[PDB]
PDB file of C-alpha atoms in Angstrom:
ATOM      1  CA  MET A   1      -4.003  13.377  23.544  1.00  0.00           C
ATOM      2  CA  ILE A   2      -4.415  16.959  24.597  1.00  0.00           C
ATOM      3  CA  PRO A   3      -3.987  20.036  22.328  1.00  0.00           C
ATOM      4  CA  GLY A   4      -0.220  20.484  21.766  1.00  0.00           C
ATOM      5  CA  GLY A   5       0.544  17.147  23.428  1.00  0.00           C
ATOM      6  CA  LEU A   6       2.997  14.531  22.020  1.00  0.00           C
ATOM      7  CA  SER A   7       1.648  11.558  20.045  1.00  0.00           C
ATOM      8  CA  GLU A   8       2.224   7.988  21.212  1.00  0.00           C
ATOM      9  CA  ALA A   9       5.677   6.491  20.363  1.00  0.00           C
ATOM     10  CA  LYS A  10       6.107   4.595  17.060  1.00  0.00           C
ATOM     11  CA  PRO A  11       9.071   2.779  15.548  1.00  0.00           C
ATOM     12  CA  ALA A  12      11.232   4.946  13.313  1.00  0.00           C
ATOM     13  CA  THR A  13      10.423   4.863   9.554  1.00  0.00           C
ATOM     14  CA  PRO A  14      12.709   5.616   6.634  1.00  0.00           C
ATOM     15  CA  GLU A  15      11.127   9.149   6.507  1.00  0.00           C
ATOM     16  CA  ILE A  16      12.208   9.722  10.153  1.00  0.00           C
ATOM     17  CA  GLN A  17      15.669   8.408   9.415  1.00  0.00           C
ATOM     18  CA  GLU A  18      15.870  10.857   6.509  1.00  0.00           C
ATOM     19  CA  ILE A  19      14.958  13.716   8.869  1.00  0.00           C
ATOM     20  CA  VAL A  20      17.794  12.612  11.242  1.00  0.00           C
ATOM     21  CA  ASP A  21      20.309  12.440   8.342  1.00  0.00           C
ATOM     22  CA  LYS A  22      19.262  15.912   7.169  1.00  0.00           C
ATOM     23  CA  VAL A  23      19.825  17.565  10.535  1.00  0.00           C
ATOM     24  CA  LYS A  24      23.058  15.686  11.514  1.00  0.00           C
ATOM     25  CA  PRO A  25      25.204  18.721  10.364  1.00  0.00           C
ATOM     26  CA  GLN A  26      23.293  20.878  12.816  1.00  0.00           C
ATOM     27  CA  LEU A  27      23.806  18.349  15.663  1.00  0.00           C
ATOM     28  CA  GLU A  28      27.552  18.187  15.102  1.00  0.00           C
ATOM     29  CA  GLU A  29      27.782  21.993  15.059  1.00  0.00           C
ATOM     30  CA  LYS A  30      25.888  22.400  18.356  1.00  0.00           C
ATOM     31  CA  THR A  31      27.521  19.536  20.217  1.00  0.00           C
ATOM     32  CA  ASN A  32      30.931  20.197  18.645  1.00  0.00           C
ATOM     33  CA  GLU A  33      31.232  16.370  18.299  1.00  0.00           C
ATOM     34  CA  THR A  34      30.849  14.232  15.123  1.00  0.00           C
ATOM     35  CA  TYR A  35      28.509  11.311  15.224  1.00  0.00           C
ATOM     36  CA  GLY A  36      29.035   8.958  12.336  1.00  0.00           C
ATOM     37  CA  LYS A  37      25.684   7.191  11.653  1.00  0.00           C
ATOM     38  CA  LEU A  38      22.856   8.269  14.020  1.00  0.00           C
ATOM     39  CA  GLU A  39      20.220   5.564  13.710  1.00  0.00           C
ATOM     40  CA  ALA A  40      16.591   6.602  14.329  1.00  0.00           C
ATOM     41  CA  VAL A  41      14.831   4.006  16.615  1.00  0.00           C
ATOM     42  CA  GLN A  42      11.501   5.465  17.797  1.00  0.00           C
ATOM     43  CA  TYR A  43       9.680   8.768  17.458  1.00  0.00           C
ATOM     44  CA  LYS A  44       6.755  10.971  18.633  1.00  0.00           C
ATOM     45  CA  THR A  45       5.241  13.966  16.834  1.00  0.00           C
ATOM     46  CA  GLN A  46       3.666  17.156  18.233  1.00  0.00           C
ATOM     47  CA  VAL A  47       1.661  19.765  16.425  1.00  0.00           C
ATOM     48  CA  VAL A  48       2.929  23.383  17.073  1.00  0.00           C
ATOM     49  CA  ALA A  49       3.043  26.234  14.483  1.00  0.00           C
ATOM     50  CA  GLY A  50       4.444  23.485  12.342  1.00  0.00           C
ATOM     51  CA  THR A  51       5.560  20.076  13.612  1.00  0.00           C
ATOM     52  CA  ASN A  52       8.070  18.930  16.233  1.00  0.00           C
ATOM     53  CA  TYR A  53       9.563  15.367  15.985  1.00  0.00           C
ATOM     54  CA  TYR A  54      10.997  13.834  19.082  1.00  0.00           C
ATOM     55  CA  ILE A  55      13.358  11.128  17.838  1.00  0.00           C
ATOM     56  CA  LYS A  56      15.293   8.564  19.846  1.00  0.00           C
ATOM     57  CA  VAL A  57      18.534   7.891  18.045  1.00  0.00           C
ATOM     58  CA  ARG A  58      21.296   5.381  18.667  1.00  0.00           C
ATOM     59  CA  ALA A  59      24.837   6.628  18.251  1.00  0.00           C
ATOM     60  CA  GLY A  60      28.290   5.239  18.603  1.00  0.00           C
ATOM     61  CA  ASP A  61      29.522   3.260  21.518  1.00  0.00           C
ATOM     62  CA  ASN A  62      25.847   2.360  22.017  1.00  0.00           C
ATOM     63  CA  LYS A  63      24.827   5.742  23.406  1.00  0.00           C
ATOM     64  CA  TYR A  64      21.329   7.139  22.852  1.00  0.00           C
ATOM     65  CA  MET A  65      20.055  10.672  22.358  1.00  0.00           C
ATOM     66  CA  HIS A  66      16.619  12.217  21.969  1.00  0.00           C
ATOM     67  CA  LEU A  67      16.484  14.782  19.200  1.00  0.00           C
ATOM     68  CA  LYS A  68      13.890  17.515  18.830  1.00  0.00           C
ATOM     69  CA  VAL A  69      13.420  18.518  15.240  1.00  0.00           C
ATOM     70  CA  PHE A  70      11.182  21.310  14.088  1.00  0.00           C
ATOM     71  CA  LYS A  71       9.703  21.023  10.593  1.00  0.00           C
ATOM     72  CA  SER A  72       8.837  24.581   9.598  1.00  0.00           C
ATOM     73  CA  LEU A  73       5.535  25.602   8.003  1.00  0.00           C
ATOM     74  CA  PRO A  74       5.258  25.677   4.156  1.00  0.00           C
ATOM     75  CA  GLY A  75       5.879  29.456   4.142  1.00  0.00           C
ATOM     76  CA  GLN A  76       9.375  28.696   5.476  1.00  0.00           C
ATOM     77  CA  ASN A  77       9.891  25.890   2.941  1.00  0.00           C
ATOM     78  CA  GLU A  78       9.338  23.163   5.569  1.00  0.00           C
ATOM     79  CA  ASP A  79      12.963  23.797   6.664  1.00  0.00           C
ATOM     80  CA  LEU A  80      14.144  21.277   9.232  1.00  0.00           C
ATOM     81  CA  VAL A  81      15.744  22.788  12.340  1.00  0.00           C
ATOM     82  CA  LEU A  82      17.332  20.887  15.202  1.00  0.00           C
ATOM     83  CA  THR A  83      15.954  22.842  18.130  1.00  0.00           C
ATOM     84  CA  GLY A  84      17.049  20.734  21.067  1.00  0.00           C
ATOM     85  CA  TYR A  85      18.312  17.334  22.130  1.00  0.00           C
ATOM     86  CA  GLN A  86      18.932  15.306  25.266  1.00  0.00           C
ATOM     87  CA  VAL A  87      22.166  13.288  25.542  1.00  0.00           C
ATOM     88  CA  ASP A  88      23.141  10.197  27.613  1.00  0.00           C
ATOM     89  CA  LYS A  89      19.725   8.596  27.251  1.00  0.00           C
ATOM     90  CA  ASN A  90      19.012   4.896  27.767  1.00  0.00           C
ATOM     91  CA  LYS A  91      17.604   2.643  25.117  1.00  0.00           C
ATOM     92  CA  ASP A  92      14.312   2.292  26.974  1.00  0.00           C
ATOM     93  CA  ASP A  93      13.925   5.912  28.204  1.00  0.00           C
ATOM     94  CA  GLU A  94      10.588   7.465  27.418  1.00  0.00           C
ATOM     95  CA  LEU A  95      10.401  10.133  24.707  1.00  0.00           C
ATOM     96  CA  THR A  96       9.002  13.190  26.624  1.00  0.00           C
ATOM     97  CA  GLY A  97       8.697  16.797  25.502  1.00  0.00           C
ATOM     98  CA  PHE A  98      11.424  19.300  26.254  1.00  0.00           C
TER      99      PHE A  98
ATOM    100  CA  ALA B   1     -28.136  36.006  13.798  1.00  0.00           C
ATOM    101  CA  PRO B   2     -27.928  33.494  10.831  1.00  0.00           C
ATOM    102  CA  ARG B   3     -27.044  32.495   8.200  1.00  0.00           C
ATOM    103  CA  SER B   4     -23.486  33.772   8.659  1.00  0.00           C
ATOM    104  CA  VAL B   5     -21.631  34.982  11.789  1.00  0.00           C
ATOM    105  CA  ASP B   6     -18.186  36.661  11.956  1.00  0.00           C
ATOM    106  CA  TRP B   7     -17.359  38.100  15.394  1.00  0.00           C
ATOM    107  CA  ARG B   8     -14.312  39.906  13.856  1.00  0.00           C
ATOM    108  CA  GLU B   9     -16.849  42.397  12.403  1.00  0.00           C
ATOM    109  CA  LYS B  10     -18.116  43.373  15.813  1.00  0.00           C
ATOM    110  CA  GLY B  11     -14.599  43.893  17.371  1.00  0.00           C
ATOM    111  CA  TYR B  12     -14.513  40.761  19.544  1.00  0.00           C
ATOM    112  CA  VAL B  13     -11.256  39.351  18.114  1.00  0.00           C
ATOM    113  CA  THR B  14      -7.608  40.377  18.419  1.00  0.00           C
ATOM    114  CA  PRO B  15      -5.163  40.033  15.480  1.00  0.00           C
ATOM    115  CA  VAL B  16      -3.743  36.616  14.796  1.00  0.00           C
ATOM    116  CA  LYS B  17      -0.867  35.547  17.062  1.00  0.00           C
ATOM    117  CA  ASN B  18       1.872  32.968  16.665  1.00  0.00           C
ATOM    118  CA  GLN B  19       2.597  30.180  19.126  1.00  0.00           C
ATOM    119  CA  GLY B  20       5.820  29.309  17.368  1.00  0.00           C
ATOM    120  CA  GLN B  21       7.555  26.087  18.297  1.00  0.00           C
ATOM    121  CA  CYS B  22       5.839  25.687  21.656  1.00  0.00           C
ATOM    122  CA  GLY B  23       2.857  23.401  22.118  1.00  0.00           C
ATOM    123  CA  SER B  24       0.770  26.189  23.573  1.00  0.00           C
ATOM    124  CA  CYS B  25      -2.182  26.319  21.140  1.00  0.00           C
ATOM    125  CA  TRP B  26      -4.442  25.613  24.064  1.00  0.00           C
ATOM    126  CA  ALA B  27      -3.363  28.930  25.693  1.00  0.00           C
ATOM    127  CA  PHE B  28      -4.021  30.872  22.491  1.00  0.00           C
ATOM    128  CA  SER B  29      -7.414  29.279  22.109  1.00  0.00           C
ATOM    129  CA  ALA B  30      -8.245  30.137  25.726  1.00  0.00           C
ATOM    130  CA  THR B  31      -7.105  33.748  25.508  1.00  0.00           C
ATOM    131  CA  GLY B  32      -9.023  34.064  22.263  1.00  0.00           C
ATOM    132  CA  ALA B  33     -12.212  32.951  23.966  1.00  0.00           C
ATOM    133  CA  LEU B  34     -11.541  35.133  27.027  1.00  0.00           C
ATOM    134  CA  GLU B  35     -10.805  38.171  24.821  1.00  0.00           C
ATOM    135  CA  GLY B  36     -14.261  37.785  23.239  1.00  0.00           C
ATOM    136  CA  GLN B  37     -16.035  37.246  26.578  1.00  0.00           C
ATOM    137  CA  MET B  38     -14.283  40.224  28.173  1.00  0.00           C
ATOM    138  CA  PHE B  39     -15.214  42.320  25.131  1.00  0.00           C
ATOM    139  CA  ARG B  40     -18.853  41.329  25.573  1.00  0.00           C
ATOM    140  CA  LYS B  41     -18.800  42.297  29.239  1.00  0.00           C
ATOM    141  CA  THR B  42     -16.706  45.493  29.030  1.00  0.00           C
ATOM    142  CA  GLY B  43     -16.849  46.757  25.466  1.00  0.00           C
ATOM    143  CA  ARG B  44     -13.085  46.783  25.391  1.00  0.00           C
ATOM    144  CA  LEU B  45     -10.721  44.523  23.485  1.00  0.00           C
ATOM    145  CA  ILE B  46      -7.413  43.751  25.296  1.00  0.00           C
ATOM    146  CA  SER B  47      -4.929  41.141  24.113  1.00  0.00           C
ATOM    147  CA  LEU B  48      -4.355  38.658  26.935  1.00  0.00           C
ATOM    148  CA  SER B  49      -1.247  36.761  28.021  1.00  0.00           C
ATOM    149  CA  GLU B  50      -0.687  33.247  26.707  1.00  0.00           C
ATOM    150  CA  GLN B  51       2.653  33.244  28.483  1.00  0.00           C
ATOM    151  CA  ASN B  52       0.899  33.832  31.841  1.00  0.00           C
ATOM    152  CA  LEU B  53      -1.050  30.638  31.128  1.00  0.00           C
ATOM    153  CA  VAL B  54       1.914  28.640  29.944  1.00  0.00           C
ATOM    154  CA  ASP B  55       3.923  29.631  33.028  1.00  0.00           C
ATOM    155  CA  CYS B  56       1.259  29.458  35.694  1.00  0.00           C
ATOM    156  CA  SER B  57      -1.485  27.032  34.857  1.00  0.00           C
ATOM    157  CA  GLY B  58       0.347  23.800  35.524  1.00  0.00           C
ATOM    158  CA  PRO B  59      -1.596  23.312  38.797  1.00  0.00           C
ATOM    159  CA  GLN B  60      -4.784  23.121  36.749  1.00  0.00           C
ATOM    160  CA  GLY B  61      -3.385  20.360  34.551  1.00  0.00           C
ATOM    161  CA  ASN B  62      -1.619  22.155  31.759  1.00  0.00           C
ATOM    162  CA  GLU B  63       1.786  21.130  30.522  1.00  0.00           C
ATOM    163  CA  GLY B  64       3.310  24.347  29.237  1.00  0.00           C
ATOM    164  CA  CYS B  65       4.862  23.811  25.817  1.00  0.00           C
ATOM    165  CA  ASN B  66       3.862  20.154  25.952  1.00  0.00           C
ATOM    166  CA  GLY B  67       0.153  20.707  25.709  1.00  0.00           C
ATOM    167  CA  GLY B  68      -2.865  21.644  27.764  1.00  0.00           C
ATOM    168  CA  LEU B  69      -6.606  22.245  27.665  1.00  0.00           C
ATOM    169  CA  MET B  70      -8.627  25.432  27.280  1.00  0.00           C
ATOM    170  CA  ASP B  71     -10.903  24.421  30.211  1.00  0.00           C
ATOM    171  CA  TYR B  72      -7.850  24.136  32.505  1.00  0.00           C
ATOM    172  CA  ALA B  73      -6.775  27.624  31.474  1.00  0.00           C
ATOM    173  CA  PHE B  74     -10.332  28.938  32.308  1.00  0.00           C
ATOM    174  CA  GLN B  75     -10.070  27.112  35.663  1.00  0.00           C
ATOM    175  CA  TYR B  76      -6.749  28.850  36.307  1.00  0.00           C
ATOM    176  CA  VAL B  77      -8.124  32.311  35.588  1.00  0.00           C
ATOM    177  CA  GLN B  78     -11.011  31.546  38.069  1.00  0.00           C
ATOM    178  CA  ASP B  79      -8.693  30.163  40.749  1.00  0.00           C
ATOM    179  CA  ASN B  80      -5.991  32.826  40.438  1.00  0.00           C
ATOM    180  CA  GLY B  81      -8.601  35.596  40.310  1.00  0.00           C
ATOM    181  CA  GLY B  82      -7.225  37.171  37.150  1.00  0.00           C
ATOM    182  CA  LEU B  83      -5.008  37.004  34.008  1.00  0.00           C
ATOM    183  CA  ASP B  84      -2.394  39.513  32.861  1.00  0.00           C
ATOM    184  CA  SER B  85      -2.557  41.448  29.656  1.00  0.00           C
ATOM    185  CA  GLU B  86      -0.208  40.382  26.758  1.00  0.00           C
ATOM    186  CA  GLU B  87       1.667  43.678  27.034  1.00  0.00           C
ATOM    187  CA  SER B  88       2.496  43.127  30.691  1.00  0.00           C
ATOM    188  CA  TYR B  89       3.442  39.475  30.352  1.00  0.00           C
ATOM    189  CA  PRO B  90       4.884  38.838  26.893  1.00  0.00           C
ATOM    190  CA  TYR B  91       5.162  35.736  24.852  1.00  0.00           C
ATOM    191  CA  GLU B  92       8.452  33.831  24.917  1.00  0.00           C
ATOM    192  CA  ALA B  93       7.492  30.469  23.388  1.00  0.00           C
ATOM    193  CA  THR B  94       9.135  28.508  26.146  1.00  0.00           C
ATOM    194  CA  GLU B  95       7.836  27.546  29.589  1.00  0.00           C
ATOM    195  CA  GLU B  96       9.133  29.908  32.258  1.00  0.00           C
ATOM    196  CA  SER B  97       8.530  30.609  35.923  1.00  0.00           C
ATOM    197  CA  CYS B  98       5.174  31.983  36.936  1.00  0.00           C
ATOM    198  CA  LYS B  99       5.425  35.754  37.153  1.00  0.00           C
ATOM    199  CA  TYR B 100       1.735  36.668  37.370  1.00  0.00           C
ATOM    200  CA  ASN B 101       1.211  40.193  38.727  1.00  0.00           C
ATOM    201  CA  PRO B 102      -2.286  41.038  39.897  1.00  0.00           C
ATOM    202  CA  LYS B 103      -1.709  44.718  39.176  1.00  0.00           C
ATOM    203  CA  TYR B 104      -1.832  43.903  35.516  1.00  0.00           C
ATOM    204  CA  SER B 105      -4.820  41.583  35.513  1.00  0.00           C
ATOM    205  CA  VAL B 106      -7.241  42.769  32.863  1.00  0.00           C
ATOM    206  CA  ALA B 107      -9.553  39.788  32.708  1.00  0.00           C
ATOM    207  CA  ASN B 108     -11.191  37.183  34.849  1.00  0.00           C
ATOM    208  CA  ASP B 109     -13.676  34.377  34.775  1.00  0.00           C
ATOM    209  CA  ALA B 110     -15.871  32.363  37.045  1.00  0.00           C
ATOM    210  CA  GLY B 111     -15.375  29.043  35.301  1.00  0.00           C
ATOM    211  CA  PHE B 112     -16.472  27.704  31.945  1.00  0.00           C
ATOM    212  CA  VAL B 113     -19.281  25.981  30.033  1.00  0.00           C
ATOM    213  CA  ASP B 114     -18.780  22.830  27.957  1.00  0.00           C
ATOM    214  CA  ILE B 115     -20.929  22.738  24.838  1.00  0.00           C
ATOM    215  CA  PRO B 116     -22.768  19.464  24.038  1.00  0.00           C
ATOM    216  CA  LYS B 117     -20.878  17.444  21.383  1.00  0.00           C
ATOM    217  CA  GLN B 118     -23.097  18.404  18.421  1.00  0.00           C
ATOM    218  CA  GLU B 119     -22.351  20.855  15.589  1.00  0.00           C
ATOM    219  CA  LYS B 120     -25.857  22.151  16.114  1.00  0.00           C
ATOM    220  CA  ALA B 121     -25.053  23.105  19.751  1.00  0.00           C
ATOM    221  CA  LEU B 122     -21.716  24.612  18.658  1.00  0.00           C
ATOM    222  CA  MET B 123     -23.519  26.746  16.088  1.00  0.00           C
ATOM    223  CA  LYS B 124     -25.923  27.978  18.784  1.00  0.00           C
ATOM    224  CA  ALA B 125     -23.032  28.867  21.083  1.00  0.00           C
ATOM    225  CA  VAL B 126     -21.109  30.740  18.374  1.00  0.00           C
ATOM    226  CA  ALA B 127     -24.210  32.711  17.407  1.00  0.00           C
ATOM    227  CA  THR B 128     -25.266  33.546  20.912  1.00  0.00           C
ATOM    228  CA  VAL B 129     -22.142  33.607  23.056  1.00  0.00           C
ATOM    229  CA  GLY B 130     -19.192  34.747  20.900  1.00  0.00           C
ATOM    230  CA  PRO B 131     -15.945  33.078  19.815  1.00  0.00           C
ATOM    231  CA  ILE B 132     -15.691  29.519  21.195  1.00  0.00           C
ATOM    232  CA  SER B 133     -12.635  27.469  22.057  1.00  0.00           C
ATOM    233  CA  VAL B 134     -12.410  24.116  20.237  1.00  0.00           C
ATOM    234  CA  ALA B 135      -9.966  21.275  19.765  1.00  0.00           C
ATOM    235  CA  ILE B 136      -9.444  19.800  16.227  1.00  0.00           C
ATOM    236  CA  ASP B 137      -7.426  17.101  14.531  1.00  0.00           C
ATOM    237  CA  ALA B 138      -4.825  19.322  12.770  1.00  0.00           C
ATOM    238  CA  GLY B 139      -2.222  16.547  12.382  1.00  0.00           C
ATOM    239  CA  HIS B 140      -2.351  16.088   8.666  1.00  0.00           C
ATOM    240  CA  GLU B 141      -0.240  17.292   5.883  1.00  0.00           C
ATOM    241  CA  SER B 142      -3.353  18.908   4.250  1.00  0.00           C
ATOM    242  CA  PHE B 143      -3.715  21.234   7.277  1.00  0.00           C
ATOM    243  CA  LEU B 144      -0.044  22.409   7.086  1.00  0.00           C
ATOM    244  CA  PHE B 145      -0.690  23.303   3.442  1.00  0.00           C
ATOM    245  CA  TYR B 146      -4.115  24.830   3.805  1.00  0.00           C
ATOM    246  CA  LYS B 147      -4.503  28.133   1.927  1.00  0.00           C
ATOM    247  CA  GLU B 148      -7.995  28.539   0.650  1.00  0.00           C
ATOM    248  CA  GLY B 149     -11.509  27.255   0.307  1.00  0.00           C
ATOM    249  CA  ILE B 150     -13.177  24.941   2.788  1.00  0.00           C
ATOM    250  CA  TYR B 151     -10.850  22.510   4.505  1.00  0.00           C
ATOM    251  CA  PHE B 152     -11.911  18.848   4.321  1.00  0.00           C
ATOM    252  CA  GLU B 153      -9.560  15.976   5.153  1.00  0.00           C
ATOM    253  CA  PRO B 154     -11.107  12.510   4.724  1.00  0.00           C
ATOM    254  CA  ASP B 155      -8.733  11.041   7.289  1.00  0.00           C
ATOM    255  CA  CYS B 156      -9.696  13.538   9.981  1.00  0.00           C
ATOM    256  CA  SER B 157     -10.524  12.225  13.367  1.00  0.00           C
ATOM    257  CA  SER B 158     -13.522  13.263  15.328  1.00  0.00           C
ATOM    258  CA  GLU B 159     -12.180  12.059  18.622  1.00  0.00           C
ATOM    259  CA  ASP B 160      -8.568  12.517  18.738  1.00  0.00           C
ATOM    260  CA  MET B 161      -7.757  16.161  18.654  1.00  0.00           C
ATOM    261  CA  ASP B 162      -4.242  17.510  18.841  1.00  0.00           C
ATOM    262  CA  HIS B 163      -4.663  21.254  18.411  1.00  0.00           C
ATOM    263  CA  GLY B 164      -6.758  23.972  20.096  1.00  0.00           C
ATOM    264  CA  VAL B 165      -8.173  26.819  18.017  1.00  0.00           C
ATOM    265  CA  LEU B 166     -10.992  29.381  18.137  1.00  0.00           C
ATOM    266  CA  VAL B 167     -14.222  29.409  16.217  1.00  0.00           C
ATOM    267  CA  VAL B 168     -15.126  33.015  15.400  1.00  0.00           C
ATOM    268  CA  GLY B 169     -18.034  32.431  13.148  1.00  0.00           C
ATOM    269  CA  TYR B 170     -19.505  30.381  10.363  1.00  0.00           C
ATOM    270  CA  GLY B 171     -20.799  30.855   6.838  1.00  0.00           C
ATOM    271  CA  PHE B 172     -21.162  29.415   3.356  1.00  0.00           C
ATOM    272  CA  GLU B 173     -19.745  29.646  -0.088  1.00  0.00           C
ATOM    273  CA  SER B 174     -20.936  28.054  -3.343  1.00  0.00           C
ATOM    274  CA  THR B 175     -18.807  24.998  -4.153  1.00  0.00           C
ATOM    275  CA  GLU B 176     -18.309  22.545  -7.000  1.00  0.00           C
ATOM    276  CA  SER B 177     -19.283  19.637  -4.752  1.00  0.00           C
ATOM    277  CA  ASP B 178     -22.052  21.403  -2.795  1.00  0.00           C
ATOM    278  CA  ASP B 179     -20.170  21.049   0.482  1.00  0.00           C
ATOM    279  CA  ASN B 180     -20.648  24.743   1.143  1.00  0.00           C
ATOM    280  CA  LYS B 181     -20.688  25.318   4.855  1.00  0.00           C
ATOM    281  CA  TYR B 182     -17.750  26.143   7.050  1.00  0.00           C
ATOM    282  CA  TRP B 183     -16.690  27.153  10.561  1.00  0.00           C
ATOM    283  CA  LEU B 184     -14.555  30.303  10.530  1.00  0.00           C
ATOM    284  CA  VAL B 185     -11.494  29.319  12.635  1.00  0.00           C
ATOM    285  CA  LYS B 186      -8.728  31.546  14.036  1.00  0.00           C
ATOM    286  CA  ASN B 187      -5.428  29.661  14.250  1.00  0.00           C
ATOM    287  CA  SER B 188      -2.250  30.732  16.222  1.00  0.00           C
ATOM    288  CA  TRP B 189       0.383  30.083  13.551  1.00  0.00           C
ATOM    289  CA  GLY B 190       0.820  33.688  12.418  1.00  0.00           C
ATOM    290  CA  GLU B 191      -0.907  35.709   9.697  1.00  0.00           C
ATOM    291  CA  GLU B 192       0.980  34.219   6.778  1.00  0.00           C
ATOM    292  CA  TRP B 193      -0.291  30.677   7.164  1.00  0.00           C
ATOM    293  CA  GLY B 194      -3.709  29.871   5.719  1.00  0.00           C
ATOM    294  CA  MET B 195      -6.185  32.682   4.870  1.00  0.00           C
ATOM    295  CA  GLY B 196      -4.596  35.440   6.881  1.00  0.00           C
ATOM    296  CA  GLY B 197      -4.036  32.984   9.705  1.00  0.00           C
ATOM    297  CA  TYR B 198      -7.607  31.625   9.599  1.00  0.00           C
ATOM    298  CA  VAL B 199      -8.996  28.385   8.123  1.00  0.00           C
ATOM    299  CA  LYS B 200     -12.572  27.722   6.953  1.00  0.00           C
ATOM    300  CA  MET B 201     -13.206  24.187   8.346  1.00  0.00           C
ATOM    301  CA  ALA B 202     -15.975  21.977   6.942  1.00  0.00           C
ATOM    302  CA  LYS B 203     -19.221  22.436   8.815  1.00  0.00           C
ATOM    303  CA  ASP B 204     -22.073  19.937   9.074  1.00  0.00           C
ATOM    304  CA  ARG B 205     -20.008  17.035   7.654  1.00  0.00           C
ATOM    305  CA  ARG B 206     -20.274  14.765  10.628  1.00  0.00           C
ATOM    306  CA  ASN B 207     -18.212  16.772  13.097  1.00  0.00           C
ATOM    307  CA  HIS B 208     -15.260  16.992  10.762  1.00  0.00           C
ATOM    308  CA  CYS B 209     -11.950  16.889  12.635  1.00  0.00           C
ATOM    309  CA  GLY B 210     -13.789  16.859  15.970  1.00  0.00           C
ATOM    310  CA  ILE B 211     -14.483  20.549  16.018  1.00  0.00           C
ATOM    311  CA  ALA B 212     -17.556  19.972  18.207  1.00  0.00           C
ATOM    312  CA  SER B 213     -16.054  17.346  20.467  1.00  0.00           C
ATOM    313  CA  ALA B 214     -14.343  19.536  23.053  1.00  0.00           C
ATOM    314  CA  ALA B 215     -15.864  23.033  22.660  1.00  0.00           C
ATOM    315  CA  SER B 216     -16.219  25.449  25.550  1.00  0.00           C
ATOM    316  CA  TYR B 217     -16.150  29.080  26.599  1.00  0.00           C
ATOM    317  CA  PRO B 218     -15.286  30.954  29.814  1.00  0.00           C
ATOM    318  CA  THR B 219     -18.067  32.350  32.087  1.00  0.00           C
ATOM    319  CA  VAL B 220     -17.344  36.054  32.702  1.00  0.00           C
TER     320      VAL B 220
END
């Protein structure tokens, strides 16, 4: 681990799934597609001025995506913001920063 | 110097900055240390460019918004022969192409010194050298919510550090539990977080959060 580096990968927890459910409206808006249930599978975290979560999610038709979700600092009410994502990922693709 | 040290009082430290959503703490910690060393050697305080580091120090081992080390940044300033001022190379919070311009270099270093892994050695360096770059375990909820007093997190790690910050001093305050000593630490999360953007981290409590595990400063 280096300062600002990503943590090791861990299986998704209910708290990570909740973060995915909370930002789904932002994902649909940016991709202009609807996703139905996005299932969190694995995740990494990264300390920034706040926290970024890199989350591998499984979508429909067995497609995967990597979501980047920024949890704001307390001063900004810990607002969750979907700040990036990578589409067409494979189940076993590594979660790397982006 | 003792029993308290606060380099802010002597003009060695720039106002608190904000790394935003980019994992560039390491670059803010490095410019903070370089700003203090250049002040010592020139009597002038100039805010330096984190973006220059984020964009150009990959060859030295840094990973832009995905992390890096303050020593690598010091190595880059030595190898490149300079670092641009903040005004000339502004912060964008995303990794961009290297656009270093030697015309606007306002700092430089010859390398760096790694402090022994002891809080006693760290105290000696802060007192005698100036602000020091350090890595800490900042990955807990208690750190996000820090606002006052001396930070102590029982679950803090002394070996796995995920954030780079800057020790500007140390001091004490009377406390209910008699854990009174702290390191004065400048963070890069903006002035609203914490105590004006700073955090008093527990000092002399067995290298709390690893503050003394990866401490260093540039040689100017």
